[PDB]
Amino acid sequence: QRKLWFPGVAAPGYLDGSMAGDRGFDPMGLGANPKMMTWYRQAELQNGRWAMLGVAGILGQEIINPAQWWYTAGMPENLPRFDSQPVNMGGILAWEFILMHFVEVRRWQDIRKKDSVNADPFNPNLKVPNPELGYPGGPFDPLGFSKGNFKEAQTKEIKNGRLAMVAFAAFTIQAQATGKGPLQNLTDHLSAPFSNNWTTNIGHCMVPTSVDVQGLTIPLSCLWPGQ
Amino acid sequence: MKDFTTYLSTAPVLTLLSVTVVAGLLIEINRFFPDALIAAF
Amino acid sequence: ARANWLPGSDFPAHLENCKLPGCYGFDPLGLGANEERLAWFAESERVHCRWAMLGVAGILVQEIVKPDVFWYTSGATVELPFDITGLLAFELFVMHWVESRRGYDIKKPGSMDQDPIFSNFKLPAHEPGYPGGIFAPFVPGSLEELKVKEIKNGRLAMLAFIGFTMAAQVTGKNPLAALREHLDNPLGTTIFSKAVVVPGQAVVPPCAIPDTIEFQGITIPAGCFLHSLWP
Amino acid sequence: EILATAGLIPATPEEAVWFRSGVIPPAGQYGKYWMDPYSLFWIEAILMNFAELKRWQDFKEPGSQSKQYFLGLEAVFGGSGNPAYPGGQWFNMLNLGKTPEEMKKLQTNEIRNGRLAMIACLGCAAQGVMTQKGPFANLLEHLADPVSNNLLGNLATILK
Amino acid sequence: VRELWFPGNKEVVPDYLDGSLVGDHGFDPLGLGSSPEQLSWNVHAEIFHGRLAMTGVAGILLTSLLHKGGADVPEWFEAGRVYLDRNPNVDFGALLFSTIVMSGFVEFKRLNDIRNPGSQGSGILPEDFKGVGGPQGRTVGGPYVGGRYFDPMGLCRGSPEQTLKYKWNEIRNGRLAMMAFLGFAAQYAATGKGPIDNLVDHVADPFHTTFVHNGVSVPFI
Amino acid sequence: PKEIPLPHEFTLNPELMAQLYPSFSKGLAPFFTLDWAQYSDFLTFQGGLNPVTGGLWLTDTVHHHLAIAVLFLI
Ligand code: CLA
Ligand code: CLA
Numbered sequence: 001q002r003k004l005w006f007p008g009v010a011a012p013g014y015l016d017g018s019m020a021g022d023r024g025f026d027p028m029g030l031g032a033n034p035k036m037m038t039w040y041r042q043a044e045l046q047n048g049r050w051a052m053l054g055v056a057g058i059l060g061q062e063i064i065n066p067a068q069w070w071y072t073a074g075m076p077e078n079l080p081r082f083d084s085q086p087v088n089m090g091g092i093l094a095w096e097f098i099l100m101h102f103v104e105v106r107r108w109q110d111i112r113k114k115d116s117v118n119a120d121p122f123n124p125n126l127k128v129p130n131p132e133l134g135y136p137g138g139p140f141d142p143l144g145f146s147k148g149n150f151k152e153a154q155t156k157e158i159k160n161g162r163l164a165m166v167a168f169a170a171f172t173i174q175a176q177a178t179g180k181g182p183l184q185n186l187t188d189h190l191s192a193p194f195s196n197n198w199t200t201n202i203g204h205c206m207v208p209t210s211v212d213v214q215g216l217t218i219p220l221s222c223l224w225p226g227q
Numbered sequence: 228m229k230d231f232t233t234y235l236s237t238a239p240v241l242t243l244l245s246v247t248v249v250a251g252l253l254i255e256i257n258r259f260f261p262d263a264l265i266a267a268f
Numbered sequence: 269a270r271a272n273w274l275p276g277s278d279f280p281a282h283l284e285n286c287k288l289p290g291c292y293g294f295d296p297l298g299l300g301a302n303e304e305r306l307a308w309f310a311e312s313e314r315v316h317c318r319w320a321m322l323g324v325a326g327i328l329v330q331e332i333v334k335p336d337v338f339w340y341t342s343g344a345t346v347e348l349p350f351d352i353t354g355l356l357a358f359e360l361f362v363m364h365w366v367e368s369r370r371g372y373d374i375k376k377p378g379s380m381d382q383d384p385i386f387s388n389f390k391l392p393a394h395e396p397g398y399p400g401g402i403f404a405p406f407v408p409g410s411l412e413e414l415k416v417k418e419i420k421n422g423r424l425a426m427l428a429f430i431g432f433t434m435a436a437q438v439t440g441k442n443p444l445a446a447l448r449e450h451l452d453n454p455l456g457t458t459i460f461s462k463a464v465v466v467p468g469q470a471v472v473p474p475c476a477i478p479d480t481i482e483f484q485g486i487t488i489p490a491g492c493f494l495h496s497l498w499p
Numbered sequence: 500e501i502l503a504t505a506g507l508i509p510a511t512p513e514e515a516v517w518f519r520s521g522v523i524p525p526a527g528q529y530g531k532y533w534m535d536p537y538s539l540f541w542i543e544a545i546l547m548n549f550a551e552l553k554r555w556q557d558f559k560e561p562g563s564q565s566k567q568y569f570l571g572l573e574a575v576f577g578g579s580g581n582p583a584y585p586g587g588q589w590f591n592m593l594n595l596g597k598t599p600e601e602m603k604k605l606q607t608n609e610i611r612n613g614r615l616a617m618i619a620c621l622g623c624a625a626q627g628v629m630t631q632k633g634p635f636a637n638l639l640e641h642l643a644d645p646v647s648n649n650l651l652g653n654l655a656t657i658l659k
Numbered sequence: 660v661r662e663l664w665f666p667g668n669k670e671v672v673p674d675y676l677d678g679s680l681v682g683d684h685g686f687d688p689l690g691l692g693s694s695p696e697q698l699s700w701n702v703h704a705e706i707f708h709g710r711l712a713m714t715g716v717a718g719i720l721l722t723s724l725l726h727k728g729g730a731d732v733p734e735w736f737e738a739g740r741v742y743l744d745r746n747p748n749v750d751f752g753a754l755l756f757s758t759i760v761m762s763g764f765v766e767f768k769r770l771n772d773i774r775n776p777g778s779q780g781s782g783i784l785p786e787d788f789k790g791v792g793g794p795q796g797r798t799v800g801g802p803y804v805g806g807r808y809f810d811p812m813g814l815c816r817g818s819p820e821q822t823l824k825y826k827w828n829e830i831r832n833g834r835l836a837m838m839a840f841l842g843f844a845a846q847y848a849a850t851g852k853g854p855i856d857n858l859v860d861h862v863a864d865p866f867h868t869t870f871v872h873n874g875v876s877v878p879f880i
Numbered sequence: 881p882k883e884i885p886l887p888h889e890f891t892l893n894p895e896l897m898a899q900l901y902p903s904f905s906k907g908l909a910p911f912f913t914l915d916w917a918q919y920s921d922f923l924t925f926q927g928g929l930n931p932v933t934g935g936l937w938l939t940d941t942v943h944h945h946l947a948i949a950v951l952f953l954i
């Protein structure tokens with residue numbers, strides 16, 4: 001706590017400062033229930049970590065593969081190839097669906113009942129020493145960066161996760177309004193900011209009204225009716 | 228409810244309802260079997 | 269801690285301290301909450317497991333020996349030594365005898381255990397659904413472990429037979445043929461490739477088995493389970 | 500209107516006028532909404548029915564709306580004494596006016612500004628009928644020639 | 660106490676609608692169930708309507724899903740005439756009479772259940788058709804008829820919590836099904852297509868396919 | 881009647897009324913200037929019956945209702 005999100009705002013009763021990165025926010029009263037508070041902290045951790053991964057992917061791809069627009073890089077015509085198996089988005093989704101289903105059911109059963117699915121299903125002697133929910137560690141922390149100041153590093157992670165979440169919202173809106181990459185957008189605005197701002201660029205949707213994926217027609221969208 | 232149904236059982240309402248039912252019935256009979264002067268069986 | 273259908277979860281209550289084999293604490297719907305129904309369902313599971321084992325083994329072998337016969341359609345394209353009417357009547361009578369005896373035995377334990385023809389012959393006392401004796405000549409290993417093995421194999425056989433039927437509906441060829449079709453192109457034979465739905469479009473696979481079939485004059489409405497409900 | 504006259508938004512200043520926005524179809528329309536006006540009114544009716552009915556039942560029962568479940572929102576619906584100032588966790592996010600005297604001063608700010616805005620809204624509607632242009636356009640054309648562009652001068656051409 | 664159809668407003672009808680009935684949220688703004696005898700009748704009627712509407716809506720949904728795979732099934736609003744055409748040897752009067760006679764047998768059974776709650780689980784019927792009671796504190800009869808015939812799989816015998824949970828599932832899905840059938844009739848009147856047809860028309864283009872655009876709801880547009 | 885403009889069309893633009901009753905081209909300026917005589921084309925004092933309909937002139941009844949409305953407000 002100490003300082004809050006707004007200068008003179010009043011911190012809520014339940015926002016004492018125990019949980020990391022808590023700035024006395026929540027103006028919507030959503031975390032007034034401890035059960036839903038734990039659920040929402042798990043959801044924030046998941047969204048923040050996935051957003052870190054996504055933003056890192058956007059930035060790294062666009063610096064390494066500048067000729068590919070991140071927004072459309074999922075279209076089958078843009079797919080980089082490694083062997084000779086024919087492309088099939090249905091085929092690729094089977095792997096991801098099944099594997100993500102397994103790992104997410106594992107995480108789910110952790111959330112439902114803490115400290116209940118920590119051991120290997122095959123060797124019931126190798127266990128994960130998860131100090132808290134959403135922080136399994138062990139094999140998930142193989143380099144051993146824990147053990148030190150856990151709360152400080154927890155705040156590091158959570159504040160970077162919030163930053164990356166808002167940055168991905170930025171990436172999506174910038175792509176849909178401008179049609180160019182994020183660092184391309186930065187280099188664009190650095191040249192003619194007076195004509196390259198959110199003004200003018202807003203109200204235009206650089207997205208097709210639909211896409212066809214090997215015979216499958218997806219209607220797409222824009223997040224805002226700007227055309 | 229109980230008092231509403233008691234009101235619906237009052238002579239002013241039940242009489243009017245029964246006259247309406249019998250009138251409707253005679254009107255229906257004359258609509259489907261009109262101009263019947265004798266009891267032709 | 270013990271063997272669980274979902275590691276980290278707890279058992280309900282009826283499924284806690286099972287005497288049935290294969291108790292992994294499933295029942296996410298509470299069907300075995302009752303205790304008469306639980307025994308009835310245990311016997312139903314056992315006979316389903318055994319019939320499906322026989323079915324999947326028969327389908328596998330018949331495909332191995334006669335690859336030119338589709339198992340699904342093989343009921344009408346096989347050329348019977350007898351007729352089809354009398355064959356079904358014989359089926360009906362024999363199965364009535366044996367199944368009624370087994371069902372009654374489950375209903376009341378000490379009952380259908382005596383040979384009718386020979387008074388001296390009689391089944392030695394058994395738990396329900398595990399007759400033994402003449403029905404179990406050779407017993408390879410500990411009985412409880414083998415009951416667990418049988419239950420595991422039967423679960424797998426029932427899942428495998430439903431898979432057989434479905435692949436026959438959507439792919440139209442016999443199981444190992446479908447496996448060979450999936451193995452030449454794993455990315456492209458999966459159901460995710462064949463079928464998919466999105467808001468605005470639905471791609472569903474056609475049914476290889478036709479709408480109707482011809483058998484000795486009459487037509488048997490043999491379609492494809494429930495089309496249109498496929499993804 | 501000021502954003503159109505400043506040219507920041509893409510609408511001619513005679514089309515970004517408030518009454519030509521589809522509220523009165525005979526008086527004008529802006530047929531480029533993501534839904535037709537009637538369906539937007541349907542969603543408005545449902546959402547405002549929720550909001551206003553909850554506000555009314557908090558006025559009648561001065562403490563309720565915080566007891567029954569509402570996706571956890573019920574935490575901020577306790578209200579206060581005066582129904583016009585609930586100022587809970589959401590209605591007073593910034594926690595402004597920590598002094599009851601300063602609260603009274605800010606309340607008087609709010610009420611004076613609100614009464615000025617009532618007068619302004621009635622004026623804008625009357626001017627819209629009376630001049631058939633926008634309120635900002637009316638202000639600019641009055642500052643241009645005050646003597647001829649006024650209430651009395653416009654009395655001949657009123658719905659033209 | 661419990662959840663109300665109107666948060667706050669504890670001026671819910673006097674305590675003949677306390678938190679005792681299944682599906683009870685204090686919704687009786689017009690007082691149609693105030694007296695206890697009428698309230699019992701209304702409970703029977705609501706459960707029966709929910710079950711019948713659940714059956715009807717499931718049948719309509721499935722028949723409209725089949726009519727989209729091209730299967731030789733008419734839509735729900737023309738199934739009667741289509742069948743009468745395709746089976747010319749049947750007489751409308753005969754079918755209507757038979758339906759009223761066979762429905763009448765079971766509905767007289769249910770009627771004499773309502774008159775005397777336990778009287779129908781005797782004589783020709785066994786004893787499982789006596790009923791398990793339920794609402795109003797009765798321990799026999801009612802809309803909930805247990806036994807091995809109306810509850811063959813025993814999904815409410817044992818575990819009172821499970822019985823209550825399943826009762827709540829039944830009541831809430833029944834109310835939803837009744838609202839859904841009202842929607843079916845209204846959509847058919849306003850548009851003239853099937854339910855699944857309307858759903859896919861809406862999801863294909865969520866705009867321009869609302870209730871405003873059908874020309875019957877908003878009558879002038 | 882199926883060709884006559886709908887009443888709101890007459891009400892909302894003084895152009896159509898001006899083509900029918902020319903004093904509507906001057907608007908309300910004569911009213912607040914007390915030059916009310918200019919409204920004599922629809923505020924008439926004629927009496928008798930309209931020769932085509934057999935009823936009182938609707939301009940006469942307009943003037944009557946305006947006058948007695950003022951008198952009752954007084
Ligand atoms: C999926 C994202 C997500 C989720 C689930 C949470 C959840 C939570 N946050 Mg968090 N937060 C987030 C994102 C999220 N946050 C982001 C992006 C930021 C940076 C601004 C923050 C900054 C932040 C602070 C400073 C604090 C919290 C706090 C909390 C906790 C209390 C609030 C609450 O109970 O309501 C639950 C919240 C939700 C259910 C999120 C719902 C989102 C709605 C439905 C949509 C809103 C759209 C959004 C405004 C648009 C964003 C885009 C825009 C930035 C361009 C809670 C566990 C407090 C805390 O630490 O608790 C201990 C606190 O101090 N958050
Ligand atoms: C100039 C107009 C004005 C003024 C002076 C006030 C003043 C006040 N309001 Mg009020 N309010 C207003 C307009 C105004 N309001 C309008 C138009 C609405 C309808 C949306 C409301 C709805 C409202 C509610 C429901 C409540 C109040 C409450 C209060 C009191 C709380 C103290 C406060 O925060 O002051 C306000 C400070 C200012 C108005 C100065 C800021 C001026 C800028 C232009 C505001 C712009 C908003 C901002 C840009 C949006 C983002 C900020 C935020 C999301 C981070 C206070 C006396 C609460 C109360 O009484 O507590 C008990 C209460 O419950 N207001």
Ligand code: CLA
Pocket residue numbers: 664676680681682683684685686687690691692698701702703704705708834835837838
């Ligand atoms: C005919 C169907 C039917 C019947 C008999 C009942 C009966 C009952 N309901 Mg119920 N309900 C229904 C449908 C029905 N409901 C539907 C479809 C919904 C979803 C909206 C609900 C939602 C609901 C709630 C939330 C609650 C009840 C409750 C109750 C009980 C107390 C209220 C009462 O007795 O009034 C009796 C009602 C009637 C006699 C129905 C009369 C209908 C009028 C005469 C016609 C107007 C309705 C309709 C809009 C008109 C459309 C016709 C036309 C447009 C085609 C009672 C036993 C309360 C309870 O506690 O249950 C125990 C309660 O909490 N109901």
Ligand SMILES: CC(/C=C/C=C(C)/C=C/[C@@]12O[C@]1(C)C[C@@H](O)CC2(C)C)=C\C=C\C=C(C)\C=C\C=C(C)\C=C\[C@@]12O[C@]1(C)C[C@@H](O)CC2(C)C
Pocket residue numbers: 686687688689690691708711712714715716718719734735736737738739837838840841
């Ligand atoms: C029975 C029913 C539906 C049954 C449907 C059937 C059999 C369908 C049959 C068939 O489709 C098949 C299967 C195949 C088709 O080919 C042919 C047909 C023949 C078409 C729905 C009832 C539907 C009934 C509905 C929707 C009733 C709504 C009642 C409401 C909203 C009442 C609310 C309140 O009464 C309270 C609760 C308290 C009061 O105080 C205040 C108010 C507000 C009055």
Ligand SMILES: CC1=C(/C=C/C(C)=C/C=C/C(C)=C/C=C/C=C(C)/C=C/C=C(C)/C=C/C2=C(C)C[C@H](O)CC2(C)C)C(C)(C)C[C@H](O)C1
Pocket residue numbers: 751752753755756759
């Ligand atoms: C009170 C009430 C109900 C009803 C209760 C009743 C009234 C029960 C008793 C019902 C009886 C005795 C019904 C008898 C019905 C006889 C019928 C419907 C005859 C139908 C034949 C017709 C209409 C004509 C058919 C031709 C056809 C089309 C072909 C030709 O050759 C010509 C012709 C013969 C004219 C219901 C709705 C069922 C439920 C309950 O909740 C409320």
Ligand SMILES: CC1=C[C@H](O)CC(C)(C)[C@H]1/C=C/C(C)=C/C=C/C(C)=C/C=C/C=C(C)/C=C/C=C(C)/C=C/C1=C(C)C[C@H](O)CC1(C)C
Pocket residue numbers: 025026027028029030031047048050051053054055057058070071073074165166168169
């Ligand atoms: C706090 C609070 C509380 C109170 O009470 C209320 C309120 C106020 C409401 C609040 C607030 C909230 C918020 C702000 C929220 C937000 C969120 C977000 C932003 C998320 C994102 C989130 C985000 C995310 C996940 C993202 C992720 C991403 C990703 C994966 C990506 C991926 C990718 C890549 C790599 C690349 C390629 O080429 C493409 C793809 C494939 C695509």
